[PDB]
Amino acid sequence: TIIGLCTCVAIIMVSCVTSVWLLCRTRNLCITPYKLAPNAQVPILLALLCC
Amino acid sequence: DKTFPIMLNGQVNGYACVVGGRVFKPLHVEGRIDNEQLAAIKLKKASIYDLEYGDVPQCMKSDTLQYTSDKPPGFYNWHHGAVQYENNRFTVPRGVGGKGDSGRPILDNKGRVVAIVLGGVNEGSRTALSVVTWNQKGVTVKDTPEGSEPW
Amino acid sequence: DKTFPIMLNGQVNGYACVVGGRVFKPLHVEGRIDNEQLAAIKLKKASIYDLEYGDVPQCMKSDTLQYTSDKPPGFYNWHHGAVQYENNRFTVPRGVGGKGDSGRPILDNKGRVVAIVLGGVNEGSRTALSVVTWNQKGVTVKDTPEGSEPW
Amino acid sequence: DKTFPIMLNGQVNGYACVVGGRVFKPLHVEGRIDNEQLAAIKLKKASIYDLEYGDVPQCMKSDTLQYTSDKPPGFYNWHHGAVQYENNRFTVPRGVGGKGDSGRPILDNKGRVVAIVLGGVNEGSRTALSVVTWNQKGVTVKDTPEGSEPW
Amino acid sequence: DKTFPIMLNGQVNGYACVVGGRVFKPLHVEGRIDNEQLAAIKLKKASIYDLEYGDVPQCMKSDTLQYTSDKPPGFYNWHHGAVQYENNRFTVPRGVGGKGDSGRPILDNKGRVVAIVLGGVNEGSRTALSVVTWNQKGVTVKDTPEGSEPW
């Protein structure tokens, strides 16, 4: 149980950090094309999925 | 001044531009910007476009370069002369442009900036420029003709 | 020169000056002195006078401003022109002074320092100035009008 | 420029010379080299010659003073005036030399470096110089009169 | 003519010359000599000096350049102009010569070849050449300035 619980927490931490890191990476890559173009369409759907 | 040289070892290793209140410089160029106001800015990385970006001080925002995505066929202006724009590609005569010219801006006949030159292609009689510009929707895109090399 | 502007982000927000062999800068003005030799000296604080001071390097000790405590009624001058000294307060026409003129000395008709301006108060006809001066016994005093603002 | 000043506290206290494609600076002359490219190179010390030296930048290998070991009786020159060489000693008119002239080479009539001056002695008619020179075999030899004070 | 270009795809990679009765070309030069009399000769690989060499046919013996080891300080000629020679070093002004000039001879005032150019180094305002020369006893030697790029 001690070994099992530590493995479960270690798996969750690696998976959650990786999941959020990719999602943060998604927002950076998804939004950057519009950050460098103030005069852009910026569709409303973008503000809902990538933010 | 609209364009600011980047100095590494005392020589100019590239140029930084300020467009629409934001300052951009080539990601692959190391050194300080030769401007006391701009040299203190901590910039963010944009690996998509091979450039770093950030805001400028409030005193500079009032006279920054104008963004435009209006790119009809014809000739465009830049530091070393004219730029020809055809088939959605920017080209200049052979021998015009090389190492150290990275980051220079290209402007239309109305004084609006259309692209930031990060590299180019050395062809037999002409050269193609590797630039970051905007598409028909006004969204930033990187233009890299086949064989492009960073300047 | 004798007056050395203080720069924070590439802009002047005050001035350092050398009087009688000491380099005086306002305490509320943060930044680097626009110099190479005088910028290397460690400064002592005089917060009761809103000043910092240090020793002038040997090569600069002779080329410094002299000061006097003799302030007869009349007109005194500084960088922006004439200054009126009446009713024991230094004052300038409305709008002549303002923020950024911090550490700028006031001179008599012989070019001698009589006060160092740190701030001011906008009155009905002239702006009263917050200055560090020397009283009738020549002792350093902070001469400020009511409601002065740091410049 | 082939002879570069050395500054410690903002004033010039000697010279660093680019002779033979190598940088030569006295040990007793503390401070940075004026040129950013010459100041960035790590230097080696030769206490037996009271000089410090190092390899020049690639571009400075050609732009260097040529040196000669042949110094027959006659006259030579430097930035303080003419130099007379007799009895193996470099003698200059009284008062011509002084502090801050160390590191400057003495030139012949062909523009070649004959000796590097480090100090001198006031003999009451002319001043004898402490130099770093070359003997008849072309070997670097320090030549100093007794009692010479480093300049 | 005693100099014959070597071309691989119609462009010149280097030159061959007849000196002393032998045909010379650098090892790194690829292609065929425009003169068929020289291209058909089987050459020995002198990796010691980066030169290929062979025997001139008797029908071509008259087209031979005289060579000498007597190279006193002074100026020598080659296809691109004057060459300055001092301290056992052959030097040309910056911008004179580059890739494609390998194998060219250096001639003195009597029309005798004193060196064959293999490459060179840009040294500031002047360019040093990597050459194959004969020493004071007439023995072939290779002179290579540090960093020389084969031409």
From Swiss-Prot, chain A:
Membrane topology of this protein: Single-pass type I membrane protein
Source taxon at top rank: Viruses
Covalent lipid sites (S-palmitoyl cysteine): C30, C50, C51
Segments of this protein annotated with the region Transient transmembrane before p62-6K protein processing: 29-49
Subcellular location: Virion membrane; Host cell membrane
PTMs per UniProt: Palmitoylated via thioester bonds. These palmitoylations may induce disruption of the C-terminus transmembrane. This would result in the reorientation of E2 C-terminus from lumenal to cytoplasmic side.
Cytoplasmic side: 28-51
Cystine bridges: C30-C51
Chain coiled-coil ranges: none
Transmembrane regions: 1-15
Subunit structure: Interacts with spike glycoprotein E1. Processing of the precursor of protein E3/E2 into E2 and E3 results in a heterodimer of the spike glycoproteins E2 and E1. Spike at virion surface are constituted of a trimer of E2-E1 heterodimers. Interacts with 6K protein. E2-E1 heterodimers interact with host VLDLR or LRP8/APOER2 to mediate viral entry. Interacts (via E2-A) with host VLDLR (via class A repeats); this interaction mediates viral entry into host cell. Interacts with host LRP8/APOER2 (via class A repeats); this interaction mediates viral entry into host cell.
Described function: Plays a role in viral attachment to target host cell, by binding to the cell receptors VLDLR or LRP8/APOER2. Synthesized as a p62 precursor which is processed by furin at the cell membrane just before virion budding, giving rise to E2-E1 heterodimer. The p62-E1 heterodimer is stable, whereas E2-E1 is unstable and dissociate at low pH. p62 is processed at the last step, presumably to avoid E1 fusion activation before its final export to cell surface.
Protein name: Spike glycoprotein E2
UniProt organism field: Eastern equine encephalitis virus
Portion of the full-length sequence here: 686 to 736 of 1239
